[PDB]
Amino acid sequence: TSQVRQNYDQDSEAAINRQINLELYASYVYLSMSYYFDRDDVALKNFAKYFLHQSHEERCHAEKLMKLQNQRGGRIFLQDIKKPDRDDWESGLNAMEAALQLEKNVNQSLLELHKLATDKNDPHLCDFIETHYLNCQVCAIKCLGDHVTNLRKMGAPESGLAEYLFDKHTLG
Amino acid sequence: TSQVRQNYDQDSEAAINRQINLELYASYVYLSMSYYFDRDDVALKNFAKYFLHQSHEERCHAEKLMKLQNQRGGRIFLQDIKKPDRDDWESGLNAMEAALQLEKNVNQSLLELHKLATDKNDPHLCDFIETHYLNCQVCAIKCLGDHVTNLRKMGAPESGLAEYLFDKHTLG
Amino acid sequence: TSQVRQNYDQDSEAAINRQINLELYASYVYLSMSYYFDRDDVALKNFAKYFLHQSHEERCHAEKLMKLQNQRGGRIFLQDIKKPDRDDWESGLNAMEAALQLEKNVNQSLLELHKLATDKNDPHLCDFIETHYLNCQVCAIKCLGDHVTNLRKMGAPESGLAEYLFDKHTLG
Amino acid sequence: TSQVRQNYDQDSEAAINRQINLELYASYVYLSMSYYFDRDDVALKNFAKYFLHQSHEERCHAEKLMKLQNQRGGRIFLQDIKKPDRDDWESGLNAMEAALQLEKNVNQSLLELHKLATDKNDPHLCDFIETHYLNCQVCAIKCLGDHVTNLRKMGAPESGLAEYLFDKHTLG
Amino acid sequence: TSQVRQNYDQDSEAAINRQINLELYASYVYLSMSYYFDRDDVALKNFAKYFLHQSHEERCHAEKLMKLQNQRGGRIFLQDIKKPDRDDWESGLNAMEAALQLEKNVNQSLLELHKLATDKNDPHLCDFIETHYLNCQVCAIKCLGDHVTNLRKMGAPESGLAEYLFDKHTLG
Amino acid sequence: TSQVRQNYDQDSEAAINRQINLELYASYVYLSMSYYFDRDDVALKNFAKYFLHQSHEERCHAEKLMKLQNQRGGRIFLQDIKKPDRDDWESGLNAMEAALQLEKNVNQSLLELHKLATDKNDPHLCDFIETHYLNCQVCAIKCLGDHVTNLRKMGAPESGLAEYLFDKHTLG
Ligand SMILES: [Ca+2]
Ligand SMILES: [Ca+2]
Structure with missing residues (x-):
C-alpha cells in the first residue's frame, strides 16, 4: 500500500498500465510510418516529419501516464511494445487512414478507461483523461480525417503528384 | 457516416444543432438591446457597447458549437433565427434583467445538453460543455445579477441619473 | 417622432429595416457555407476561413445600417433571419457561384434602396449607400467573379486537385 | 433566494460552507507548523517558509470557495476555526507526515463533496472541484509523500544533520 | 527555558498569545465582511476588495506577532479563531462602522498590552508595539472614521447611489 | 534492389536492424529506471531526470540508425521492443551499475557491428559507427563508472543520505 x-x-x-503500453505502441507505429516515407523510394520528407512528430507525441502521453501512475500511488508495470502490423505502408493516403484507425482505437481505449473511472467514482482520474486525452483525440482524429479526405480528392494514391503536393502544402 | x-x-x-440555434438567437437578442441604447432617445453608449459585445460573444459561442459538430462528425442544420421578444427594451435596468433571464435560459439549455451527454456516456461532450460553457454562464449570470442589483439600488429605472452614472462608472 | x-x-x-434583415440573412448564408468547408469530408480550411470572414463582414454591414437608422431618427424593427437555401453546398465552385448570386442580390436591393432615396430626394441616404455599400458590392462581385472563373478553368468541381490548390493559392 | x-x-x-471551514482549518494547521520551525530550539527557516506558504495556499482555496458560493447564489456562513490538535510538532519529518494526513483528509472531503455534486446533477460544481481542487490535492499529496520518503531515507528524525540538509537542499 | x-x-x-488570536479574529471579521459585498444582492466590489485587503493585513500582523513571540523566547499557543458576530453586514456604512469598532477594540487591547509591557519594564516589547501597531491603528481608525463620515453624509445607507459612488470614488 | x-x-x-532494436530496448530500459525514481517511495527527481534524458538519447541513436538504413538503401524491419529485466531497480547505485552494463552491452554490439563492417570492407558504415557511437559509448561508460564509484564511496545504498546528496550534487 x-x-x-x-x-x-x-x-x-x-x-x-494497460494504457501506457498502448500509447507506447501507437508511438512505435508512428515511428514506423515516419521512416517509411524517408525511404529513397517513397521520398516524402514532410509525411516523414509529420509522423515522427506524431510519434514523439504518443511517447509524451505515455510518460504522462507513467507520471499519473506514480502520482496516485499505483505501480508501473511495462510490457513488450509489440511491433507495428506492417513494415511497408504503401502510400501517403494509406498511412493516413491507418493512423485514423490507430487514433480511433486509442480513443476507444481512453473512453473505456474513462467509463471505468466513472464506475469506480474516481473524479481525479476522470478529469485527467478528459483534459489530457479525450479532447486531443477528437482533434487528432479530425485532423486525420481531413488529410485523408484531401488526399482522396486530390487523386491519391494513383496520382503521385497528389501525394507530392499534399506533402508540400499541408504537411509543409 | x-x-x-x-x-x-x-x-x-x-x-x-439546437444549442447552436439558441446561441444565434441570444446573439440576436443582444444585438437588439445594443442598438436600443444607441437610439437618440435612450443615448447610453456604454449599455450599447456592453450588449454589442455580448452579442458578438454569443455568436462566437455559436461558431464554436458548429466547430464541435464537425469535429465529432455530426452534420450541421441551421434553422431560422427567431426575432427578439421586443424592439423597445424600456430601460437599462430592464434590459439588464432580460439579459439575466436570457442567460439563465441558455444555461438551462446547456444543463439539459450536459445531462444528455452523461446519459449517453459521452465524456468528451461533457468536458466540452464543462470547460467552455457551464463555467462562462455562471460568471455571466453573476455579472448580470450584479448589474441588475446596482441599477436597482442606484434608483433605476425611476432615476435617469442612476442609469447615466452606471453607464459611465460600471459599463465605461 | x-x-x-x-x-x-x-x-x-x-x-x-428590410436591408438590415437582408444583410443579416447574407451573413447567415455565409456562416453556413464556412462551416460546410469545415466538415471532415470537405476539408477546405481556407474556403471555411474565407466565408467565415464574409459572414463577419456582412454582419458588420447590418450593424452600420442599424446605426444609420438611429442616426436619422428612424426606428429599428428586426425580423426572423431565415435559414439559407441549402445545408450542403457541394463544392468550392458551387459555393462561389452561390456567393456571387447572393452578392448581386444584395446589390440589387441596395440599388433599389438608392433609387428610393433619390425619389424621396434624400441626398444623405444616397451618399451613405454610395460610399459605404455600392463600392464594396462592385468589388465583392468582381472578387467572386474571378474566383468562380479560376475554379472553372482549373477543372472544378470534377477536379478535386483544383479545389485543393485554389484553397491554398488564392484563398491562402 | x-x-x-x-x-x-x-x-x-x-x-x-463546510468545506470553506475545512480549508481555513488547514490554513491554521500549517500556520502553526510554520512558526514551530521558526522557534530558536527547532530553527529550520525553510521548513517554516514552506509551511507558511502552504498556509497561505489553503487560505486562498477557502477564499476561492467563498467566491464560488456567491457566484452560484449560495450564502456564506462562517464557523469558528478550530485550533490545530498540536502545539509542538516534534520534528520536520513528523510535521511532514502530519501535513500528508491533513491533505488526504481535505482530499477525502473534496471527493465526498464531488460525489454529492454528482448525486445532484450539478456539473458546474463538478468541474469547479476537478479543476481547482482535485488535481491540486493529488500533486500536493505526492509532494509530501516524497518529502516524507526522503527524510526517512536520510535518517530523520534521529539525525539532526538530516533534517538540516533537507531544509537546505529540498526546501531551499 | x-x-x-x-x-x-x-x-x-x-x-x-492573546493578541495573536485577536489579530487573527479581526482578520476573520474582515474576510466575512469582504465576501458580504461580493454577494450578488450587495454587489460592491471595491468594498469587497477593500475589506479583503484589511483582512490580509490583520493576518500579517498576527504573523509578525507570532514571530515576536519566538524572537523573545516565548512559546506560541493557538486558540480557536471565533467566528464573527454577523453573517449579514447590512450595508457599506454599517460594515464601515463595525470595522471602526473592531479597530478601536484591537487598539484598546494593544494599549493594555503596552502598559503591561511597561509595568514589566520591557522596553523592547514596548517599542515593538509603538512602531508596528499603535500608529497603524490610529491611522486605520481615522481612515475608517473618515469613511463613515462620507458614507453618512452622502446619505448612506438609505441611498444606494451613495454607497455605489463611494465604492467607485473612494474605494476605487 | x-x-x-x-x-x-x-x-x-x-x-x-538488429542494432536499431537494441538501441530502442536500451531506451526502454532507461525509461523504466527513470520512472522508478519518480515513485513516491524512491523520490529522487534528478536520478529520474538523468535516466529520462538517457532514454531520449537512446531513441535518437535508434532513429539515426533507421536514417542510416534508408540512407544506404537497406530496408528497416522493426521488432517487438522487449520489456526491461526488472520493474523495481532497488536503489540509485543499483540502477547506475545496471546502466553501466547496459552501455557496455550495447558497446559490445557496436564493436561487433564495426568488425563486420570492416570484414565486409564498408568504410562508410565504419566511419558512421566510429564517429556516432564508439566514442559516445566510451564517454557514457566512463560517466557511469564514475557515478557508481562516487555512490559506492558515499555509503550507498545503505546510506539514504548518500543517494540524496548525490542526486543533488552530481545529477543536479
Ligand atoms: Ca457621393
Ligand atoms: Ca472536467
Whole structure:
C-alpha cells in the first residue's frame, strides 16, 4: 500500500498500465510510418516529419501516464511494445487512414478507461483523461480525417503528384 | 457516416444543432438591446457597447458549437433565427434583467445538453460543455445579477441619473 | 417622432429595416457555407476561413445600417433571419457561384434602396449607400467573379486537385 | 433566494460552507507548523517558509470557495476555526507526515463533496472541484509523500544533520 | 527555558498569545465582511476588495506577532479563531462602522498590552508595539472614521447611489 | 534492389536492424529506471531526470540508425521492443551499475557491428559507427563508472543520505 494512494482502484491502476503500453505502441507505429516515407523510394520528407512528430507525441502521453501512475500511488508495470502490423505502408493516403484507425482505437481505449473511472467514482482520474486525452483525440482524429479526405480528392494514391503536393502544402 | 464519428449519439448531434440555434438567437437578442441604447432617445453608449459585445460573444459561442459538430462528425442544420421578444427594451435596468433571464435560459439549455451527454456516456461532450460553457454562464449570470442589483439600488429605472452614472462608472 | 429626424422619409426607413434583415440573412448564408468547408469530408480550411470572414463582414454591414437608422431618427424593427437555401453546398465552385448570386442580390436591393432615396430626394441616404455599400458590392462581385472563373478553368468541381490548390493559392 | 441561483442544491451549498471551514482549518494547521520551525530550539527557516506558504495556499482555496458560493447564489456562513490538535510538532519529518494526513483528509472531503455534486446533477460544481481542487490535492499529496520518503531515507528524525540538509537542499 | 529569553515576563508572553488570536479574529471579521459585498444582492466590489485587503493585513500582523513571540523566547499557543458576530453586514456604512469598532477594540487591547509591557519594564516589547501597531491603528481608525463620515453624509445607507459612488470614488 | 544501394552487404543491413532494436530496448530500459525514481517511495527527481534524458538519447541513436538504413538503401524491419529485466531497480547505485552494463552491452554490439563492417570492407558504415557511437559509448561508460564509484564511496545504498546528496550534487 502506497502512502499517497487514495481512492485509486485496482482496476484503474492496471488499466493505466494497460494504457501506457498502448500509447507506447501507437508511438512505435508512428515511428514506423515516419521512416517509411524517408525511404529513397517513397521520398516524402514532410509525411516523414509529420509522423515522427506524431510519434514523439504518443511517447509524451505515455510518460504522462507513467507520471499519473506514480502520482496516485499505483505501480508501473511495462510490457513488450509489440511491433507495428506492417513494415511497408504503401502510400501517403494509406498511412493516413491507418493512423485514423490507430487514433480511433486509442480513443476507444481512453473512453473505456474513462467509463471505468466513472464506475469506480474516481473524479481525479476522470478529469485527467478528459483534459489530457479525450479532447486531443477528437482533434487528432479530425485532423486525420481531413488529410485523408484531401488526399482522396486530390487523386491519391494513383496520382503521385497528389501525394507530392499534399506533402508540400499541408504537411509543409 | 462520418469517418471521424465515434461515441457520438444522434440525440447529442440534434441537441448540439439546437444549442447552436439558441446561441444565434441570444446573439440576436443582444444585438437588439445594443442598438436600443444607441437610439437618440435612450443615448447610453456604454449599455450599447456592453450588449454589442455580448452579442458578438454569443455568436462566437455559436461558431464554436458548429466547430464541435464537425469535429465529432455530426452534420450541421441551421434553422431560422427567431426575432427578439421586443424592439423597445424600456430601460437599462430592464434590459439588464432580460439579459439575466436570457442567460439563465441558455444555461438551462446547456444543463439539459450536459445531462444528455452523461446519459449517453459521452465524456468528451461533457468536458466540452464543462470547460467552455457551464463555467462562462455562471460568471455571466453573476455579472448580470450584479448589474441588475446596482441599477436597482442606484434608483433605476425611476432615476435617469442612476442609469447615466452606471453607464459611465460600471459599463465605461 | 425623433428630435433628430429631418428629411428622412418613412418609406426609406422601412427600406432600411428590410436591408438590415437582408444583410443579416447574407451573413447567415455565409456562416453556413464556412462551416460546410469545415466538415471532415470537405476539408477546405481556407474556403471555411474565407466565408467565415464574409459572414463577419456582412454582419458588420447590418450593424452600420442599424446605426444609420438611429442616426436619422428612424426606428429599428428586426425580423426572423431565415435559414439559407441549402445545408450542403457541394463544392468550392458551387459555393462561389452561390456567393456571387447572393452578392448581386444584395446589390440589387441596395440599388433599389438608392433609387428610393433619390425619389424621396434624400441626398444623405444616397451618399451613405454610395460610399459605404455600392463600392464594396462592385468589388465583392468582381472578387467572386474571378474566383468562380479560376475554379472553372482549373477543372472544378470534377477536379478535386483544383479545389485543393485554389484553397491554398488564392484563398491562402 | 438569489436571482442568479440555478441548479444549486441546498445540500451542495451547505457542503461548500463546510468545506470553506475545512480549508481555513488547514490554513491554521500549517500556520502553526510554520512558526514551530521558526522557534530558536527547532530553527529550520525553510521548513517554516514552506509551511507558511502552504498556509497561505489553503487560505486562498477557502477564499476561492467563498467566491464560488456567491457566484452560484449560495450564502456564506462562517464557523469558528478550530485550533490545530498540536502545539509542538516534534520534528520536520513528523510535521511532514502530519501535513500528508491533513491533505488526504481535505482530499477525502473534496471527493465526498464531488460525489454529492454528482448525486445532484450539478456539473458546474463538478468541474469547479476537478479543476481547482482535485488535481491540486493529488500533486500536493505526492509532494509530501516524497518529502516524507526522503527524510526517512536520510535518517530523520534521529539525525539532526538530516533534517538540516533537507531544509537546505529540498526546501531551499 | 529558551536560550534567547531575556527580560521577557511570563505575563507579557501570555498577553502576546492573546493578541495573536485577536489579530487573527479581526482578520476573520474582515474576510466575512469582504465576501458580504461580493454577494450578488450587495454587489460592491471595491468594498469587497477593500475589506479583503484589511483582512490580509490583520493576518500579517498576527504573523509578525507570532514571530515576536519566538524572537523573545516565548512559546506560541493557538486558540480557536471565533467566528464573527454577523453573517449579514447590512450595508457599506454599517460594515464601515463595525470595522471602526473592531479597530478601536484591537487598539484598546494593544494599549493594555503596552502598559503591561511597561509595568514589566520591557522596553523592547514596548517599542515593538509603538512602531508596528499603535500608529497603524490610529491611522486605520481615522481612515475608517473618515469613511463613515462620507458614507453618512452622502446619505448612506438609505441611498444606494451613495454607497455605489463611494465604492467607485473612494474605494476605487 | 535499391537505387541508392552500393557496397552495403546483406549482413550489414540485417545487423543495423538488429542494432536499431537494441538501441530502442536500451531506451526502454532507461525509461523504466527513470520512472522508478519518480515513485513516491524512491523520490529522487534528478536520478529520474538523468535516466529520462538517457532514454531520449537512446531513441535518437535508434532513429539515426533507421536514417542510416534508408540512407544506404537497406530496408528497416522493426521488432517487438522487449520489456526491461526488472520493474523495481532497488536503489540509485543499483540502477547506475545496471546502466553501466547496459552501455557496455550495447558497446559490445557496436564493436561487433564495426568488425563486420570492416570484414565486409564498408568504410562508410565504419566511419558512421566510429564517429556516432564508439566514442559516445566510451564517454557514457566512463560517466557511469564514475557515478557508481562516487555512490559506492558515499555509503550507498545503505546510506539514504548518500543517494540524496548525490542526486543533488552530481545529477543536479
Ligand atoms: Ca457621393
Ligand atoms: Ca472536467
